[PDB]
Nucleic acid binder design. Structure first.
Ligand SMILES: Nc1nc2c(ncn2[C@@H]2O[C@H](COP(=O)(O)OP(=O)(O)OP(=O)(O)O)[C@@H](O)[C@H]2O)c(=O)[nH]1
Length: 1073
RNA sequence: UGUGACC
């Protein structure tokens, strides 16, 4: 509830010269008071009359009404930022050392020195690409500095540490003035020219870093990173986070968690001695020297200190540095440089080929339907991303231009041009338009924006491999419904005094030109074997067209822009843009380690406890017959690196007996760690989401970081949200959304009023507002309807249908239509219409709901019904689980020490339902969890027509539709769909064991009725309420349920008429994918 | 229509 208040201290801070609180109430007479108070307030302000009287006069509204929004009327020239910044600029501005970076443009020169003219300029290399200004990030900081000016004791040491650092920014910024941004939140030439090219993005990186400073060690790390990061823009992060790969092999294991047969974490009190060959210490020092030579001082000592004893208890510092290294910003080079960096393989290609076979064998041998109708599968899965060229399109009586695949597939069909039989060339004659991938730390990488013919030809076969992966443990990233905790235990499992883990980063190998041949070759070779396993025209064709793209790509040409020119150079490496990218890379990376391990066995004899490939890393745990020694480690480590060398693969390969470090995670001292390097004030690229959407994503990013071990002051986060979600009515009148508006479970939710706890409307006003917002959730788009009606479209939707369905089916059909209408949202013009509407709507909205004939039910209502039939009473749970994830805040860790954690993802798509399994045996169609949710609630005879109308044979449709499974499915679909709506797999909850016995105790639910659905929700709602209470108070409570029998049937009905809510908060979570 | 693949 503090938002609404911290919101005023802010406005009254930014503006000095008025605020007009706007309330509302579900109660008619109180609302009319809410209306009167409003106007009376406007009036007095329109006369410079103190509102003090009215605030007393209408004290009733203040007290019993819900704050809807705070109106801010300010008449300043909005340069108050410039003015306000002086006070903090009394330190010596930083002077960029233009010597630290290789490429010249990476050095912090003046903009003009890099770009002499306005036609040569480009923010392309610094663009914060986010929808909030640098002025704001500035205002935010100062606002907070003022509020914690007179704080005492420790808060002061936090204020101080912070005030200091801000100066560095403030002073440096003041020297060249503050860079003003345009309506699109971009920094142009006129403003950037005189100022250092990287002033802005660095300011942003530095602000976000200093506002995440608390302890002295923080401050030390910030300050250091903030200074060097003003000159170094290319090796800092890599330099700072490089040591961590070795630090993990130095901490002894004193009690760890392993994985048991039930594939779940189980404590193991074992001790494993970290065995390290001297050479490693050399390597680690060489890394410490490099750290120093590049200016670093404070950070290198922290590690050197740590290295005396190397206590897993004093490892939180090392982890902290590793996570901070990333907040320096992204490394955005020039496409050209990004692209320029570019007989013993016999074994390595044989394995790749054998792996491509295993995966597709059965599907091929048994003329799988998916492999046959793969062309339809690709079409239905086609996204509305780029195709490469910017074609002119004819829709109805309108010719517009677009690059969208969905737009090009359509147009192409309506003109006999749709020809997937012909897989376009990608050579010198038809160069690949390029894309990029920017990440903090590593150098930029290019990306092939291949023609849609390439997706379609690969979609189905890729999916068939991913399935083989789903149940092959070696593929960590894909195995079962597993989260990272599982992979954590699979390693710590076989560890001991006679084994050694071998990890390897191979990101450089996959881009290496050496790989590109044995890679594409092994796949093709494999595809051949498969082709010889059938005669099915369908299979051979799609199996063949796959072989085709694996050739056109062998000798590929790329379109690198080199200025305002687009040179065509020859690309001889495997870039990524295909559908097989992730799968193939997984296949390849694993084929590799197998190749390496196989070779080193000629000398040393060991056993393979586990082999794994996960993203751009690949590791294995070997076991020897004798106790391992420093010398044994050195030898293995050498023969390995040497084996990799004989393949001309530039890769980092380490060998330890206690931990590992890979891009996704690292295991130090038997504990699990995940880098907390998600940037907040700078983004990789510009999407299409709105500001609100970005507000929510900021917050989301805050939560993930926080859980990972990097906390940005929440007061700062809330300030940014106050900024980003606002809506300007005129040049002076700006409207600010209230806490109720932004946190309630609506279509406009941005964040949770309290971290790790998701509330739902439990009061009338809350219900009122919730139902009001939903009413204006989806907006009209003239442009979207125009094409939604055009011929090529209807024909498109039609052609897809007649191809999928056998008999009639209106649910599918009505779906395919919308499913395709939505894709148009990637088209900017439409997107823009939408947002404009949403604003005006949500504009008048924050003024008077009322008229909204609610009739739709949501998870809120369901819960709000159940709420009153429970009795809480103080309970208690002892801490009985040792911590394995050190970084977790304290209130979230607690829940785990009491009820435990999980290593799987709760099924929330209805994929395990029998009916869904059925449809996938005879159909290429994929129904959402929300469709199955309705299809399962249909009259027995309707479900039978659905099934048949998708190619499901009667002996099957008729058999299922009756069976007991249909009933169990009925429950399973609902059970799955509800979890989906409660976000049981996100943020905080995904961590918890919702089936913990310890938890089950606190839940006392007398089953006065044998009606599964109701029993279900009652227990879950209770498990949630218990855990929330524990997440806030630190103590536990028990729940007793006295839900009526009569009511149960009333509820069960409500259950099957639930609507899914769509919001920025929701999408934010989906973005964490 | 300052936009730039897979997932
Ligand atoms: N290209 C690529 N991007 C990835 C990969 N894995 C994750 N990402 C990125 O992941 C960001 C998502 O971060 P998350 O995966 O949601 O962080 P998290 O993994 O959900 O934290 P949890 O897994 O507990 O463990 C996106 O912006 C992606 O670009 C990958 O293997 N390849």
């Amino acid at each position: 509830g503090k938002y609404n208040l911290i919101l005023s201290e802010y406005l009254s801070f930014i503006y000095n010269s008025v605020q007009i609180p706007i309330y509302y109430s579900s109660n008619s007479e109180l609302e009319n008071r809410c209306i009167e108070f409003h106007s009376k307030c406007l009036e007095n302000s329109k006369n410079g009359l103190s509102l003090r009287k009215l605030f007393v006069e209408y004290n009733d509204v203040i007290e019993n009404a819900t704050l809807l929004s705070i109106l801010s009327y300010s008449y300043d020239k909005y340069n108050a930022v410039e003015r306000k910044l002086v006070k903090y600029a009394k330190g010596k501005p930083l002077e960029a050392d233009l010597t630290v970076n290789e490429l010249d443009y990476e050095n912090n020169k003046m903009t003009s020195e890099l770009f002499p003219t306005a036609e040569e300029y480009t923010d392309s290399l610094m663009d914060p690409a986010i929808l909030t200004s640098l002025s704001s990030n500035l205002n935010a900081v100062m606002f907070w500095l003022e509020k914690h000016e007179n704080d005492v004791a420790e808060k002061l040491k936090v204020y101080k540490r912070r005030l200091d650092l801000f100066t560095i920014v403030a002073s440096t910024i003041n020297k060249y003035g503050v860079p003003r941004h345009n309506a699109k939140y971009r920094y142009e030439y006129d403003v950037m020219k005189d100022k250092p090219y990287y002033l802005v993005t660095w300011a942003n990186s530095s602000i976000e870093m200093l506002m995440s400073v608390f302890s002295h060690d923080d401050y030390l790390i910030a300050k250091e990173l903030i200074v060097l990061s003003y000159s170094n823009r290319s090796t800092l992060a890599k330099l700072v986070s490089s040591p961590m790969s070795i630090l993990v092999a130095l901490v002894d294991i004193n009690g760890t968690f392993i994985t048991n047969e039930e594939l779940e974490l189980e404590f193991s009190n074992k001790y494993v001695r970290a065995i390290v060959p001297d050479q490693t210490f050399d390597e680690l020092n060489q890394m410490l020297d490099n750290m120093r030579k590049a200016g670093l001082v404070d950070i290198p000592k922290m590690i050197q200190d740590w290295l005396v004893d190397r206590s897993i208890e004093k490892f939180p510092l090392m982890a902290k540095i590793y996570s901070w290294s990333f907040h320096v910003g992204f490394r955005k080079q020039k496409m050209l440089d990004a692209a320029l960096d570019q007989e013993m393989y016999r074994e390595y290609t044989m394995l790749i080929r054998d792996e491509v076979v295993k995966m597709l064998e059965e599907p091929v041998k048994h003329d799988d339907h998916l492999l046959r109708d793969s062309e339809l599968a690709g079409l239905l899965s086609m996204s509305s991303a780029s195709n490469g060229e910017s074609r002119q399109l004819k829709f109805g009586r309108k010719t517009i231009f677009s690059t969208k695949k969905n737009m090009h597939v359509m147009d192409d069909m309506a003109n006999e041009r749709y020809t997937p039989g012909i897989i376009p060339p990608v050579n010198v004659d038809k160069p690949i338009p390029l894309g990029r991938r920017d990440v903090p730390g590593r150098r930029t990488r290019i990306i092939f924006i291949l023609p849609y013919e390439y997706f379609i030809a690969q979609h189905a076969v890729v999916e068939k491999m991913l399935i083989y992966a789903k149940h092959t443990r070696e593929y960590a990233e894909f195995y079962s419904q597993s989260n990272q905790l599982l992979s954590y235990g699979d390693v710590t499992r076989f560890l001991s005094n006679n084994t050694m883990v071998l990890y390897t980063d191979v990101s450089q190998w996959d881009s290496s030109q050496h790989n590109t041949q044995p890679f594409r070759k092994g796949i093709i070779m494999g595809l051949d074997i498969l082709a010889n396993m059938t005669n099915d025209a369908k299979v051979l064709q799609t199996l063949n067209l796959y072989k085709q793209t694996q050739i056109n790509l062998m000798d590929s040409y790329v379109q690198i822009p080199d200025g305002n020119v687009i040179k065509k150079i020859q690309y001889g490496a495997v870039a990524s843009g295909e559908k097989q990218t992730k799968a193939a890379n997984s296949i390849a990376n694993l084929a590799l380690i197998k190749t390496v391990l196989s070779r080193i066995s000629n000398k040393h004899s060991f056993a393979t406890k586990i082999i794994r490939v996960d993203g751009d890393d690949n590791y294995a745990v070997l076991q020897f017959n004798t106790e391992v020694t420093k010398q044994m480690i050195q030898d293995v480590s050498n023969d390995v690196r040497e084996t990799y060398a004989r393949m001309n693969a530039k890769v980092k390969a380490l060998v330890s007996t206690v931990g590992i470090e890979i891009a996704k995670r690292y295991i130090a001292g038997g504990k699990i760690f995940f880098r907390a390097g998600i940037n907040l004030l700078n983004n990789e690229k510009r999407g299409q989401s709105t500001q609100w959407d970005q507000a929510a994503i900021l917050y989301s990013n805050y939560i993930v970081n926080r859980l990972r071990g990097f906390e940005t002051d929440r007061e700062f986060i809330l300030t940014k949200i106050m900024q980003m979600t606002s809506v300007a009515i005129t040049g002076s009148l700006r409207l600010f959304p209230s806490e109720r508006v932004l946190t309630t479970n609506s279509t406009f939710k941005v964040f949770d009023s309290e971290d790790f706890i998701i509330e739902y409307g439990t009061t009338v006003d809350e219900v009122y507002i919730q139902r009001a917002f939903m009413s204006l959730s989806s907006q009209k788009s003239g442009i979207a309807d125009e094409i939604a009606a055009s011929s090529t479209f209807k024909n498109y939707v039609t052609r897809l249908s007649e191809q999928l369905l056998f008999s009639k089916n209106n649910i599918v059909s009505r779906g395919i239509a919308l499913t395709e209408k939505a894709k148009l949202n990637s088209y900017a013009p439409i997107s823009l219409e939408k947002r404009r509407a949403q604003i005006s709507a949500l504009l008048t909205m924050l003024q008077k709901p009322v008229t909204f004939k609610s009739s739709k039910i949501t998870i809120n209502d369901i819960l709000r019904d159940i709420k009153p039939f429970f009795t809480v009473s103080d309970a208690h749970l002892p801490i009985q689980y040792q911590k394995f994830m050190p970084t977790l805040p304290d209130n979230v860790q607690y829940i785990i020490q009491c009820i435990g954690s999980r290593t799987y993802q709760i099924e929330d798509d209805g994929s395990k339902s029998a009916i869904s399994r059925l449809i996938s045996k005879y159909s290429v169609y994929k129904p959402s969890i929300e469709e199955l949710y309705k299809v399962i609630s249909l009259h027995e005879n309707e479900i039978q027509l659905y099934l048949i109308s998708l190619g499901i044979p009667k002996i099957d449709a008729d058999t299922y539709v009756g069976s007991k499974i249909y009933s169990r499915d009925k429950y399973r679909i609902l059970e799955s769909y509800v979890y989906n709506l409660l976000s049981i797999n996100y943020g905080c909850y995904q961590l918890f064991d919702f089936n913990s016995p310890d938890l089950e105790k606190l839940i006392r639910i007398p089953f006065k009725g044998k009606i599964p659905a109701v029993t279900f929700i009652l227990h879950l709602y209770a498990k949630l309420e218990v855990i929330n209470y524990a997440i806030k108070n630190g103590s536990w409570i028990s729940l007793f349920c006295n839900y009526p029998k009569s009511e149960m049937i009333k509820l069960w009905k409500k259950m099957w008429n639930i609507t899914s809510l769509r919001s920025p908060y929701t999408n934010a979570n989906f973005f964490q994918e």
